[PDB]
Amino acid sequence: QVQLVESGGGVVQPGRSLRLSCAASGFTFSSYTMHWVRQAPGKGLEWVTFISYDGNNKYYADSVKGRFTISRDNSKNTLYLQMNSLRAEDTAIYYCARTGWLGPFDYWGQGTLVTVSSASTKGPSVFPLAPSGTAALGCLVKDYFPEPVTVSWNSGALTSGVHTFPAVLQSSGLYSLSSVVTVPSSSLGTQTYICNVNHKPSNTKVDKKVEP
């Protein structure tokens, strides 16, 4: 039916520029007004900017006035957000949204993620969390950037009992993460438990055997 498709997300350093685009189909584009709405990691929704059908009325939240530019090209059915002088606090998923005739945001795009950090791509350091009826052992996946990271146990052969925690952001700009799994303690001497950690942005995959 009516679809909104967003394209422009990515990872950039602070102070830089980045243009988001929202291609729209399934309706007459130039008859509705459009919005950008952003959502920081683990936080609520926040209205960003508004544009009318004509293009002669643009409104901006105080967070972004003077740095963000909303625009639309009806001949291509596209809404744009030019983001300038980017700050770390701008890190969020950005949605385009349509205002129905009646007033609310009736159709939302799928969301592009935008990350603003001064860190450089960095593979993680992996350390074993050794164990000592049921026992626990795990993996410390430390000091990587950016998200995400894929953790698997025994190459995916071990899924029952696995907890991979969400990454906490450290003061350095790098993320850190822990994955654990509980096992029958009777297996610590016989079964081998190998951490598998994949960080696609840095081109690093490593395996760490975890032992008493």
Place this chain on the structure above:
Amino acid sequence: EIVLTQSPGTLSLSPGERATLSCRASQSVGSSYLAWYQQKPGQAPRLLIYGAFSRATGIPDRFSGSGSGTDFTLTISRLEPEDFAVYYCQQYGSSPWTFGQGTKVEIKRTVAAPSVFIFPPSDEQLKSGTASVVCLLNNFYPREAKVQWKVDNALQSGNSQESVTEQDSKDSTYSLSSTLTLSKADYEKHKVYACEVTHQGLSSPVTKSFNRGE
């Protein structure tokens, strides 16, 4: 500077039970230009209610909105598994299109006490010059717990970080990991490392510990 305040922050019910979510406005939404949105985990929001009582096209009948002035309510009459999400209220039509901070509806189960584990820093980490001590709270409910670290019975503060899983799909519990950061020099000075956990399901706080180098 209108503030929409949603309550409660988190709402914990069993499946099949009725859910009531509230949105209080700092000033009156005289137009009743109030919307409710559903955001399922990992998805963009979808409009549920507009004009504060009008069901959007293609929304199940169990969702319903009511209220006026400064107080609006969203009612989910029979919580299906797909209904356990976060819900935002919104005033539209005017200056900031302000949102509420959101209400999360999670699955209610009986209390579960966490299984506690402590992990000493690995030799590999120490060889790199850092020391991380990890305490794990496994499969507990409800989500609120507190973890205290004691290095030789000295209470730490400001040097630990904690992450929490989302509600498990099979048994609706939570898991928590706490990571104490010390300098390698500090870790080598003291002997006994303990994490002390307090939780609803524990009669008295459970303490798991280890002495360094053993």
